[PDB]
């Protein structure tokens, strides 16, 4: 069984930027989610081999995880905050597509998502 290659975290053709919102996304938003007790299943790409989930990458064609997001932010991969926010939303959406309500991974995602939304409700200015 095989995992796909992970999402790219660097691209030498993609214009890079640092914005105050992107800085906040790394130093406030990602930091707070990463240290949460429910973060661990979301800190790296889903390992469908180890979890024996052979349908995971049949169902989820746009995978995303906080390890990828962390690296993208550290690399200045993004041009704007909305690109990064979309990656978080993709991560949560994928979880809700694949898994069922009341599964532990879903309860964990829901709590992380509430925290995410609380922090992005106060995005700073440039």
């Amino acid at each position: 069984s095989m995992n796909p290659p992970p999402p790219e975290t660097s691209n030498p053709n993609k214009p890079k930027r640092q914005t105050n919102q992107l800085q906040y996304l790394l130093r406030v938003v990602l930091k707070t989610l990463w240290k949460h007790q429910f973060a661990w299943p979301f800190q790296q790409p889903v390992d469908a081999v180890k979890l024996n989930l052979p349908d995971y990458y049949k169902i989820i064609k746009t995978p995303m995880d906080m390890g990828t997001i962390k690296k993208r932010l550290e690399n200045n991969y993004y041009w704007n905050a909305q690109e990064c926010i979309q990656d978080f939303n993709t991560m949560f959406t994928n979880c809700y597509i694949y898994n069922k309500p009341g599964d532990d991974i879903v309860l964990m995602a829901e709590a992380l998502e509430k925290l995410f939304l609380q922090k992005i409700n106060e995005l700073p200015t440039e």
Binding site: Q37, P41, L51, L53, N99, D103, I105, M108
Partner: peptide
């Protein structure tokens, strides 16, 4: 199937 039981860190 799903991912099973997950304990908090």
């Amino acid at each position: 199937p799903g991912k099973g039981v997950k304990s908090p860190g």
